[PDB]
mmCIF file of N, CA and C in Angstrom:
data_model
loop_
_atom_site.group_PDB
_atom_site.id
_atom_site.type_symbol
_atom_site.label_atom_id
_atom_site.label_comp_id
_atom_site.label_asym_id
_atom_site.label_seq_id
_atom_site.Cartn_x
_atom_site.Cartn_y
_atom_site.Cartn_z
ATOM 1 N N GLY A 1 -58.666 59.574 -67.816
ATOM 2 C CA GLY A 1 -57.379 60.328 -68.268
ATOM 3 C C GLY A 1 -57.530 61.745 -68.524
ATOM 4 N N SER A 2 -58.569 62.454 -67.855
ATOM 5 C CA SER A 2 -58.988 63.750 -68.332
ATOM 6 C C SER A 2 -59.119 64.702 -66.989
ATOM 7 N N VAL A 3 -58.458 65.829 -66.992
ATOM 8 C CA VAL A 3 -58.727 66.882 -65.844
ATOM 9 C C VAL A 3 -59.713 67.875 -66.352
ATOM 10 N N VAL A 4 -59.539 68.470 -67.496
ATOM 11 C CA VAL A 4 -60.327 69.405 -68.170
ATOM 12 C C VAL A 4 -60.583 68.878 -69.623
ATOM 13 N N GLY A 5 -61.535 67.852 -69.678
ATOM 14 C CA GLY A 5 -61.816 67.258 -71.067
ATOM 15 C C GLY A 5 -60.750 66.311 -71.689
ATOM 16 N N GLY A 6 -59.499 66.359 -71.263
ATOM 17 C CA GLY A 6 -58.535 65.409 -71.711
ATOM 18 C C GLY A 6 -57.109 65.655 -71.243
ATOM 19 N N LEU A 7 -56.768 66.668 -70.484
ATOM 20 C CA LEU A 7 -55.504 66.999 -70.090
ATOM 21 C C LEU A 7 -54.902 66.145 -68.662
ATOM 22 N N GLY A 8 -55.599 65.042 -68.546
ATOM 23 C CA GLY A 8 -55.462 64.170 -67.446
ATOM 24 C C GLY A 8 -54.086 63.617 -67.187
ATOM 25 N N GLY A 9 -53.252 63.588 -68.297
ATOM 26 C CA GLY A 9 -51.754 63.276 -68.182
ATOM 27 C C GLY A 9 -50.870 64.630 -68.012
ATOM 28 N N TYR A 10 -51.467 65.692 -67.908
ATOM 29 C CA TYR A 10 -50.756 66.996 -67.804
ATOM 30 C C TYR A 10 -50.397 67.368 -66.374
ATOM 31 N N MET A 11 -49.554 68.204 -65.978
ATOM 32 C CA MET A 11 -49.242 68.615 -64.705
ATOM 33 C C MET A 11 -49.182 70.178 -64.717
ATOM 34 N N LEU A 12 -49.053 70.808 -63.492
ATOM 35 C CA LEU A 12 -49.451 72.268 -63.274
ATOM 36 C C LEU A 12 -48.289 72.851 -62.750
ATOM 37 N N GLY A 13 -47.780 74.004 -63.321
ATOM 38 C CA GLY A 13 -46.428 74.607 -63.057
ATOM 39 C C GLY A 13 -46.341 75.298 -61.575
ATOM 40 N N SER A 14 -45.204 75.589 -61.330
ATOM 41 C CA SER A 14 -44.655 76.109 -60.034
ATOM 42 C C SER A 14 -45.376 77.649 -59.499
ATOM 43 N N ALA A 15 -46.099 78.317 -60.517
ATOM 44 C CA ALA A 15 -46.608 79.557 -60.293
ATOM 45 C C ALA A 15 -45.634 80.661 -59.720
ATOM 46 N N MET A 16 -44.676 80.883 -60.522
ATOM 47 C CA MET A 16 -43.628 81.630 -60.062
ATOM 48 C C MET A 16 -42.826 82.702 -61.033
ATOM 49 N N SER A 17 -43.311 82.917 -62.219
ATOM 50 C CA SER A 17 -42.727 83.570 -63.413
ATOM 51 C C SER A 17 -43.797 84.439 -64.056
ATOM 52 N N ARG A 18 -43.424 85.682 -64.520
ATOM 53 C CA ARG A 18 -44.136 86.427 -65.485
ATOM 54 C C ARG A 18 -43.163 87.462 -65.951
ATOM 55 N N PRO A 19 -42.372 87.057 -66.834
ATOM 56 C CA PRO A 19 -40.987 88.015 -67.383
ATOM 57 C C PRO A 19 -41.520 89.254 -68.168
ATOM 58 N N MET A 20 -40.898 90.289 -67.978
ATOM 59 C CA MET A 20 -41.106 91.419 -69.070
ATOM 60 C C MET A 20 -40.565 91.130 -70.430
ATOM 61 N N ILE A 21 -41.374 91.110 -71.441
ATOM 62 C CA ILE A 21 -40.794 90.884 -72.948
ATOM 63 C C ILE A 21 -41.052 92.075 -73.789
ATOM 64 N N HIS A 22 -40.319 92.169 -74.868
ATOM 65 C CA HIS A 22 -40.137 93.349 -75.492
ATOM 66 C C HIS A 22 -40.262 93.354 -77.042
ATOM 67 N N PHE A 23 -41.277 93.720 -77.630
ATOM 68 C CA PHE A 23 -41.703 93.418 -78.910
ATOM 69 C C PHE A 23 -41.050 94.190 -80.013
ATOM 70 N N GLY A 24 -40.111 95.236 -79.556
ATOM 71 C CA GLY A 24 -39.258 96.150 -80.376
ATOM 72 C C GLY A 24 -39.849 97.542 -80.343
ATOM 73 N N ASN A 25 -41.113 97.530 -79.920
ATOM 74 C CA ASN A 25 -41.715 99.041 -79.572
ATOM 75 C C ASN A 25 -42.523 98.766 -78.192
ATOM 76 N N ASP A 26 -42.666 99.919 -77.501
ATOM 77 C CA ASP A 26 -43.629 100.177 -76.404
ATOM 78 C C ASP A 26 -44.978 100.150 -76.915
ATOM 79 N N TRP A 27 -45.299 99.756 -78.181
ATOM 80 C CA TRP A 27 -46.617 99.704 -78.666
ATOM 81 C C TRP A 27 -47.448 98.538 -78.079
ATOM 82 N N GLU A 28 -46.932 97.262 -78.092
ATOM 83 C CA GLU A 28 -47.335 95.925 -77.666
ATOM 84 C C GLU A 28 -46.649 95.504 -76.409
ATOM 85 N N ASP A 29 -45.441 95.768 -76.378
ATOM 86 C CA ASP A 29 -44.599 95.703 -75.005
ATOM 87 C C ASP A 29 -45.450 96.154 -73.954
ATOM 88 N N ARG A 30 -45.895 97.707 -74.057
ATOM 89 C CA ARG A 30 -46.629 98.275 -73.010
ATOM 90 C C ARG A 30 -48.011 97.500 -72.743
ATOM 91 N N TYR A 31 -48.672 97.195 -73.868
ATOM 92 C CA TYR A 31 -49.951 96.632 -73.961
ATOM 93 C C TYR A 31 -49.879 95.378 -72.969
ATOM 94 N N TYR A 32 -49.006 94.518 -73.086
ATOM 95 C CA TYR A 32 -48.593 93.367 -72.132
ATOM 96 C C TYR A 32 -48.504 93.717 -70.891
ATOM 97 N N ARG A 33 -47.679 94.832 -70.479
ATOM 98 C CA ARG A 33 -47.346 95.049 -69.100
ATOM 99 C C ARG A 33 -48.679 95.716 -68.372
ATOM 100 N N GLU A 34 -49.659 96.041 -69.083
ATOM 101 C CA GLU A 34 -50.958 96.444 -68.597
ATOM 102 C C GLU A 34 -51.780 95.300 -68.644
ATOM 103 N N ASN A 35 -51.640 94.055 -69.520
ATOM 104 C CA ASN A 35 -52.297 92.982 -69.697
ATOM 105 C C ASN A 35 -51.892 91.701 -69.268
ATOM 106 N N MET A 36 -50.704 91.602 -68.425
ATOM 107 C CA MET A 36 -50.061 90.504 -68.039
ATOM 108 C C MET A 36 -50.806 89.787 -66.894
ATOM 109 N N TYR A 37 -51.528 90.587 -66.005
ATOM 110 C CA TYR A 37 -52.219 90.153 -64.848
ATOM 111 C C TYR A 37 -53.214 88.867 -65.152
ATOM 112 N N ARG A 38 -54.011 89.206 -66.156
ATOM 113 C CA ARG A 38 -55.058 88.267 -66.592
ATOM 114 C C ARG A 38 -54.403 86.890 -67.040
ATOM 115 N N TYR A 39 -53.245 86.904 -67.531
ATOM 116 C CA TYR A 39 -52.798 85.603 -68.129
ATOM 117 C C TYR A 39 -52.404 84.662 -66.958
ATOM 118 N N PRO A 40 -52.378 83.353 -67.140
ATOM 119 C CA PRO A 40 -52.024 82.372 -66.062
ATOM 120 C C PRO A 40 -50.431 82.701 -65.927
ATOM 121 N N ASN A 41 -50.029 82.923 -64.710
ATOM 122 C CA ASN A 41 -48.609 82.692 -64.235
ATOM 123 C C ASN A 41 -48.288 81.213 -64.467
ATOM 124 N N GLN A 42 -49.142 80.236 -64.208
ATOM 125 C CA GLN A 42 -48.974 78.894 -64.239
ATOM 126 C C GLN A 42 -48.853 78.446 -65.675
ATOM 127 N N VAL A 43 -48.264 77.306 -65.862
ATOM 128 C CA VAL A 43 -48.036 76.603 -67.212
ATOM 129 C C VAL A 43 -48.459 75.229 -67.033
ATOM 130 N N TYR A 44 -49.179 74.556 -68.010
ATOM 131 C CA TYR A 44 -49.489 73.061 -67.978
ATOM 132 C C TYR A 44 -48.491 72.310 -68.965
ATOM 133 N N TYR A 45 -47.961 71.169 -68.295
ATOM 134 C CA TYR A 45 -46.710 70.538 -68.976
ATOM 135 C C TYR A 45 -46.727 69.016 -68.684
ATOM 136 N N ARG A 46 -45.539 68.224 -69.014
ATOM 137 C CA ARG A 46 -45.470 66.874 -68.588
ATOM 138 C C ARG A 46 -43.924 66.587 -68.283
ATOM 139 N N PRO A 47 -43.779 65.410 -67.436
ATOM 140 C CA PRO A 47 -42.500 65.265 -66.931
ATOM 141 C C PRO A 47 -41.251 65.030 -67.916
ATOM 142 N N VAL A 48 -40.465 65.988 -68.141
ATOM 143 C CA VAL A 48 -39.212 66.034 -69.006
ATOM 144 C C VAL A 48 -38.176 64.842 -68.525
ATOM 145 N N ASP A 49 -38.478 64.295 -67.511
ATOM 146 C CA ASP A 49 -37.602 63.065 -66.997
ATOM 147 C C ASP A 49 -37.771 62.045 -68.281
ATOM 148 N N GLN A 50 -38.764 62.009 -68.972
ATOM 149 C CA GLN A 50 -39.257 61.134 -70.052
ATOM 150 C C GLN A 50 -38.719 61.586 -71.265
ATOM 151 N N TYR A 51 -38.098 62.713 -71.488
ATOM 152 C CA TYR A 51 -37.883 63.507 -72.851
ATOM 153 C C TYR A 51 -36.416 63.735 -73.054
ATOM 154 N N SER A 52 -36.017 63.473 -74.291
ATOM 155 C CA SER A 52 -34.505 64.115 -74.514
ATOM 156 C C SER A 52 -34.194 65.325 -74.300
ATOM 157 N N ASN A 53 -35.102 66.227 -74.164
ATOM 158 C CA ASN A 53 -35.029 67.706 -73.807
ATOM 159 C C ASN A 53 -36.371 68.271 -73.550
ATOM 160 N N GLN A 54 -36.359 69.355 -72.784
ATOM 161 C CA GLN A 54 -37.530 70.007 -72.311
ATOM 162 C C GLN A 54 -38.179 70.843 -73.518
ATOM 163 N N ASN A 55 -37.412 71.345 -74.582
ATOM 164 C CA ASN A 55 -37.836 72.130 -75.570
ATOM 165 C C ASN A 55 -38.883 71.577 -76.283
ATOM 166 N N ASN A 56 -38.858 70.485 -76.595
ATOM 167 C CA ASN A 56 -40.104 69.716 -77.300
ATOM 168 C C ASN A 56 -41.488 69.870 -76.179
ATOM 169 N N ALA A 57 -41.202 69.626 -74.984
ATOM 170 C CA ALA A 57 -42.431 69.320 -74.041
ATOM 171 C C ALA A 57 -42.727 70.909 -73.818
ATOM 172 N N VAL A 58 -41.887 71.902 -73.627
ATOM 173 C CA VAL A 58 -42.073 73.417 -73.470
ATOM 174 C C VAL A 58 -43.114 73.766 -74.760
ATOM 175 N N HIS A 59 -42.651 73.383 -76.061
ATOM 176 C CA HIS A 59 -43.386 73.889 -77.082
ATOM 177 C C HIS A 59 -44.778 73.176 -77.269
ATOM 178 N N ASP A 60 -45.066 72.026 -76.614
ATOM 179 C CA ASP A 60 -46.176 71.415 -76.496
ATOM 180 C C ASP A 60 -46.972 72.174 -75.285
ATOM 181 N N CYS A 61 -46.337 72.383 -74.270
ATOM 182 C CA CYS A 61 -46.917 73.054 -73.005
ATOM 183 C C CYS A 61 -47.376 74.409 -73.128
ATOM 184 N N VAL A 62 -46.794 75.301 -74.093
ATOM 185 C CA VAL A 62 -47.171 76.554 -74.405
ATOM 186 C C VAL A 62 -48.627 76.425 -74.986
ATOM 187 N N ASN A 63 -48.871 75.578 -76.066
ATOM 188 C CA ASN A 63 -50.126 75.539 -76.681
ATOM 189 C C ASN A 63 -51.231 74.928 -75.660
ATOM 190 N N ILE A 64 -50.774 74.106 -74.793
ATOM 191 C CA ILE A 64 -51.680 73.486 -73.955
ATOM 192 C C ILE A 64 -52.124 74.486 -72.748
ATOM 193 N N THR A 65 -51.105 75.306 -72.353
ATOM 194 C CA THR A 65 -51.384 76.301 -71.337
ATOM 195 C C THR A 65 -52.376 77.134 -71.652
ATOM 196 N N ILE A 66 -52.199 77.822 -72.862
ATOM 197 C CA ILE A 66 -53.317 78.732 -73.549
ATOM 198 C C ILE A 66 -54.641 78.041 -73.645
ATOM 199 N N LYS A 67 -54.471 76.681 -74.079
ATOM 200 C CA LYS A 67 -55.717 75.804 -74.174
ATOM 201 C C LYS A 67 -56.179 75.635 -72.675
ATOM 202 N N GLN A 68 -55.727 74.849 -71.824
ATOM 203 C CA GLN A 68 -56.126 74.847 -70.423
ATOM 204 C C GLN A 68 -56.638 76.171 -69.843
ATOM 205 N N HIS A 69 -56.301 77.124 -70.276
ATOM 206 C CA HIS A 69 -56.863 78.445 -69.800
ATOM 207 C C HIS A 69 -58.129 78.678 -70.575
ATOM 208 N N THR A 70 -58.150 79.164 -71.842
ATOM 209 C CA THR A 70 -59.035 79.500 -72.826
ATOM 210 C C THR A 70 -60.235 78.479 -72.773
ATOM 211 N N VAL A 71 -59.994 77.098 -72.554
ATOM 212 C CA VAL A 71 -61.074 76.193 -72.566
ATOM 213 C C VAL A 71 -61.974 76.194 -71.449
ATOM 214 N N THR A 72 -61.472 76.559 -70.213
ATOM 215 C CA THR A 72 -62.111 76.741 -69.205
ATOM 216 C C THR A 72 -62.863 78.181 -69.158
ATOM 217 N N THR A 73 -62.506 79.013 -70.086
ATOM 218 C CA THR A 73 -62.949 80.491 -70.245
ATOM 219 C C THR A 73 -64.134 80.437 -71.188
ATOM 220 N N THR A 74 -63.805 79.766 -72.265
ATOM 221 C CA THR A 74 -64.891 79.768 -73.578
ATOM 222 C C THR A 74 -65.937 78.687 -73.141
ATOM 223 N N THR A 75 -65.874 77.905 -72.143
ATOM 224 C CA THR A 75 -67.114 77.309 -71.433
ATOM 225 C C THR A 75 -67.883 78.415 -70.629
ATOM 226 N N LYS A 76 -67.371 79.775 -70.659
ATOM 227 C CA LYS A 76 -68.183 80.695 -70.079
ATOM 228 C C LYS A 76 -68.515 81.814 -71.211
ATOM 229 N N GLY A 77 -68.600 81.311 -72.442
ATOM 230 C CA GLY A 77 -68.959 82.067 -73.599
ATOM 231 C C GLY A 77 -67.815 83.149 -73.984
ATOM 232 N N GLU A 78 -66.610 82.913 -73.505
ATOM 233 C CA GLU A 78 -65.404 83.809 -73.690
ATOM 234 C C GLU A 78 -64.915 83.335 -75.014
ATOM 235 N N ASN A 79 -63.907 83.991 -75.548
ATOM 236 C CA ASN A 79 -63.009 83.715 -76.600
ATOM 237 C C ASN A 79 -61.744 84.505 -76.553
ATOM 238 N N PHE A 80 -60.693 83.960 -77.052
ATOM 239 C CA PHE A 80 -59.416 84.538 -77.104
ATOM 240 C C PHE A 80 -59.020 84.664 -78.477
ATOM 241 N N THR A 81 -58.148 85.791 -78.888
ATOM 242 C CA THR A 81 -57.856 86.090 -80.312
ATOM 243 C C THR A 81 -56.362 86.146 -80.399
ATOM 244 N N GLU A 82 -55.812 86.051 -81.728
ATOM 245 C CA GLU A 82 -54.379 85.703 -81.795
ATOM 246 C C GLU A 82 -53.524 86.718 -81.065
ATOM 247 N N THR A 83 -53.837 88.057 -81.179
ATOM 248 C CA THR A 83 -52.990 88.978 -80.504
ATOM 249 C C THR A 83 -52.927 88.940 -79.037
ATOM 250 N N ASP A 84 -54.073 88.203 -78.375
ATOM 251 C CA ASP A 84 -53.979 87.916 -77.023
ATOM 252 C C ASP A 84 -53.007 86.858 -76.887
ATOM 253 N N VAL A 85 -53.103 85.590 -77.672
ATOM 254 C CA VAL A 85 -52.378 84.471 -77.496
ATOM 255 C C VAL A 85 -50.916 84.777 -77.834
ATOM 256 N N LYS A 86 -50.488 85.820 -78.592
ATOM 257 C CA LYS A 86 -49.171 86.219 -78.955
ATOM 258 C C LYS A 86 -48.541 86.857 -77.622
ATOM 259 N N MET A 87 -49.403 87.418 -76.728
ATOM 260 C CA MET A 87 -48.919 88.012 -75.522
ATOM 261 C C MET A 87 -48.872 87.061 -74.432
ATOM 262 N N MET A 88 -49.361 85.872 -74.594
ATOM 263 C CA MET A 88 -48.978 84.681 -73.702
ATOM 264 C C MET A 88 -47.895 83.998 -74.254
ATOM 265 N N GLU A 89 -47.665 83.598 -75.425
ATOM 266 C CA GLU A 89 -46.511 82.744 -75.912
ATOM 267 C C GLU A 89 -45.199 83.378 -75.488
ATOM 268 N N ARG A 90 -45.024 84.835 -75.575
ATOM 269 C CA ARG A 90 -43.892 85.432 -75.340
ATOM 270 C C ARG A 90 -43.441 85.151 -73.831
ATOM 271 N N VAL A 91 -44.497 85.012 -72.903
ATOM 272 C CA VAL A 91 -44.255 84.681 -71.399
ATOM 273 C C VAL A 91 -44.298 83.224 -71.294
ATOM 274 N N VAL A 92 -45.232 82.293 -71.822
ATOM 275 C CA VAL A 92 -45.565 81.127 -71.493
ATOM 276 C C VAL A 92 -44.442 80.285 -71.901
ATOM 277 N N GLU A 93 -43.743 80.505 -73.050
ATOM 278 C CA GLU A 93 -42.451 79.832 -73.336
ATOM 279 C C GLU A 93 -41.395 80.203 -72.218
ATOM 280 N N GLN A 94 -41.257 81.507 -71.923
ATOM 281 C CA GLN A 94 -40.316 81.786 -70.688
ATOM 282 C C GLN A 94 -40.687 80.959 -69.379
ATOM 283 N N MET A 95 -41.857 80.837 -69.137
ATOM 284 C CA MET A 95 -42.543 80.392 -67.730
ATOM 285 C C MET A 95 -42.332 78.805 -67.858
ATOM 286 N N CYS A 96 -42.781 78.158 -68.919
ATOM 287 C CA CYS A 96 -42.603 76.723 -69.028
ATOM 288 C C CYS A 96 -41.214 76.437 -69.304
ATOM 289 N N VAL A 97 -40.284 77.007 -70.026
ATOM 290 C CA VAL A 97 -38.903 76.825 -70.027
ATOM 291 C C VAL A 97 -38.428 77.111 -68.618
ATOM 292 N N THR A 98 -38.576 77.968 -67.791
ATOM 293 C CA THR A 98 -38.169 78.249 -66.501
ATOM 294 C C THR A 98 -38.578 77.098 -65.368
ATOM 295 N N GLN A 99 -39.981 76.720 -65.589
ATOM 296 C CA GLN A 99 -40.478 75.842 -64.748
ATOM 297 C C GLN A 99 -39.627 74.484 -65.034
ATOM 298 N N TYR A 100 -39.590 74.011 -66.166
ATOM 299 C CA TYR A 100 -38.831 72.971 -66.641
ATOM 300 C C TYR A 100 -37.462 72.944 -66.024
ATOM 301 N N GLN A 101 -36.799 74.152 -66.321
ATOM 302 C CA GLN A 101 -35.403 74.434 -65.872
ATOM 303 C C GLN A 101 -35.302 74.780 -64.330
ATOM 304 N N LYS A 102 -36.396 74.452 -63.632
ATOM 305 C CA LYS A 102 -36.217 74.301 -62.028
ATOM 306 C C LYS A 102 -36.541 72.929 -61.688
ATOM 307 N N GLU A 103 -37.685 72.276 -62.456
ATOM 308 C CA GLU A 103 -38.171 70.890 -62.019
ATOM 309 C C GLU A 103 -37.151 69.865 -62.524
ATOM 310 N N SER A 104 -36.260 70.218 -63.383
ATOM 311 C CA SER A 104 -35.363 69.315 -63.910
ATOM 312 C C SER A 104 -33.970 69.711 -63.816
ATOM 313 N N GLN A 105 -33.717 70.502 -62.526
ATOM 314 C CA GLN A 105 -32.627 71.052 -62.209
ATOM 315 C C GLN A 105 -32.687 71.070 -60.523
ATOM 316 N N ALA A 106 -33.448 71.916 -60.068
ATOM 317 C CA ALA A 106 -33.707 72.019 -58.617
ATOM 318 C C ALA A 106 -34.333 70.898 -57.855
ATOM 319 N N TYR A 107 -34.557 69.853 -58.574
ATOM 320 C CA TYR A 107 -34.974 68.563 -57.969
ATOM 321 C C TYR A 107 -33.913 67.490 -57.783
ATOM 322 N N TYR A 108 -32.982 67.620 -58.625
ATOM 323 C CA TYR A 108 -31.797 66.598 -58.721
ATOM 324 C C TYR A 108 -30.432 67.281 -58.486
ATOM 325 N N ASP A 109 -30.245 68.420 -59.208
ATOM 326 C CA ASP A 109 -28.983 69.110 -59.377
ATOM 327 C C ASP A 109 -27.899 68.098 -59.500
ATOM 328 N N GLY A 110 -28.171 67.217 -60.590
ATOM 329 C CA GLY A 110 -27.164 66.117 -60.921
ATOM 330 C C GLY A 110 -27.441 64.854 -60.049
ATOM 331 N N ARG A 111 -28.769 64.630 -59.619
ATOM 332 C CA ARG A 111 -29.189 63.698 -58.650
ATOM 333 C C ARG A 111 -28.269 63.646 -57.534
ATOM 334 N N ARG A 112 -28.511 64.509 -56.522
ATOM 335 C CA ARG A 112 -27.640 64.677 -55.343
ATOM 336 C C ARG A 112 -26.276 65.112 -55.521
ATOM 337 N N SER A 113 -25.941 65.865 -56.584
ATOM 338 C CA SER A 113 -24.738 66.426 -56.950
ATOM 339 C C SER A 113 -24.456 67.761 -56.344
ATOM 340 N N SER A 114 -25.540 68.398 -55.916
ATOM 341 C CA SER A 114 -25.429 69.669 -55.223
ATOM 342 C C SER A 114 -26.909 69.711 -54.456
#
């Protein structure tokens, strides 16, 4: 039950989102627009079909995405620091929410309702 040390129950997102996010100044809003490429566009998550709402599974997914990234990276002597992580959470929240909001929408649209 392990894909990368233990994430063997997790699934891997649609690879389709990287929103612009706005910290309230172009100080770190810009830093991100020059630092967004490195971040995973993908997010690691679990089937919301099983959950009362995706938000619980999103907020898990955020932590796990960062982890599934950094874990494979610090295996290479790398390390990540809070101000890097804060530049993923802004997006990885959006991306995991949006992946969920297509996996749990664009798969059923009310189970064959549209």
